[PDB]
Amino acid sequence: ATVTVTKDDTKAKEAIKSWVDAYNSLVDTFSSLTKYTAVEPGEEASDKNGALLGDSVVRTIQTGIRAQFANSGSNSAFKTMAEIGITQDGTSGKLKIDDDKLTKVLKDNTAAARELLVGDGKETGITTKIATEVKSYLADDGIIDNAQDNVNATLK
Amino acid sequence: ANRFTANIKGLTQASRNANDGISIAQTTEGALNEINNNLQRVRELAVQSANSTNSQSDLDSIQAEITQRLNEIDRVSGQTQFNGVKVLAQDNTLTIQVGANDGETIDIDLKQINSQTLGLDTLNVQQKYKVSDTAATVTGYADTTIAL
Amino acid sequence: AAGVTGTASVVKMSYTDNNGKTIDGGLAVKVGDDYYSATQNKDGSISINTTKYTADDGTSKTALNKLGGADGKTEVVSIGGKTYAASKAEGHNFKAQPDLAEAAATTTENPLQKIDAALAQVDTLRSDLGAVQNRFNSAITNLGNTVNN
């Protein structure tokens, strides 16, 4: 009676799509919160504009997340998301995946992707750095909370 | 009362001038955000090129999208305008009156942001091919329209 | 008739890469220091391809397509003592639109450095616009209150 053991990429790909979708939703939220709209000369901005139009916190967060993509020091052979079949659009800023290329690399060099995405978990790992920054933002002192405390000023 | 009325009307007109100024600034931001996104895609593709094992054909293919994005930057830069003002046209300064007397303005600075000014027009990542030159297997014959 | 001549012969360049991978080239007229792409015509004439353009002296001109570029095989033209891409040079206003820069000669150094500098400029500018936006919002608030009073 025979037994077989192979490799499981399903769970991984599976997992990755959720992260990409979450990031895309976040970008959508940015766009909605700072929706621009031109107006006639001589008249102040239109009401329909996003409530955060002209704010710098949104830019701060959006920029801060991105640079975490370019992880530093990771021993993983790959150094970029394209190498693992994930690309970012230069006009919309959203993330897309070449699913079959992802599958191929999964079967080929899963270890390099392991190192690149997380690795040791101390400093290596785009997710590691991103988690650091996201926690920093969400903190009580985090930019959003200190801006929501200058907006607890806008309130109190 | 005359002084008060003069100040009132002047301040109203200043308010509308401020309307225009804020609008132009917001449009400038709107353009700059997309410009920045494009540049970030460009950096992604460059670090993708950083894969030393890739072929020169792959390098050329990547350079294709690099050129596409550069042309897109030029398009957007030449496109964006406000009330007949090409916002990114050239290194320029605008003074907007917001007071009620002479020389009472807010100053704004604008730049000729484009592929050329940023200096990324000439950027490239390709590697020169090895080319062997020979008469090659030119089968058949040439039957040119000779001037007999 | 172009006024420059040499080892004019019909060739089809073949290619190789760092990986030694099998890759082929194309038909061209070998001269020597210069190689010009050639097209095979219905009458068998291996005719050297040419690029159309507006001359920098005010006239309309055309010149042979010379191989080159950062790859060494792109079709390029020389106008005003400098080499420019055949794709770009087509009918361009070389006279009063100097925006067309020379075709890339080789691999570019520290492109990441250049990109980072550009992005720094863009970010600084955006921050400036945000600051002036806030200034103008303050100004409008001041004007409204003052008008009321």
Numbering used by the authors:
A (entry chain S): 261 to 416
B (entry chain C): 51 to 198
C (entry chain C): 298 to 446
Kindly provide excerpts from the paper associated with this entry.
The flagellum is the most prominent extracellular structure in bacteria, with a molecular weight in the hundreds of megadaltons. Structurally, the flagellum can be divided into three major components: basal body, hook and filament. A ring-like structure formed by the proteins FlgK and FlgL, termed the hook–filament junction (HFJ), forms the connection between the flexible hook and the rigid filament. To assemble a filament, flagellin monomers are secreted through the flagellar basal body and hook, and polymerize at the distal end.
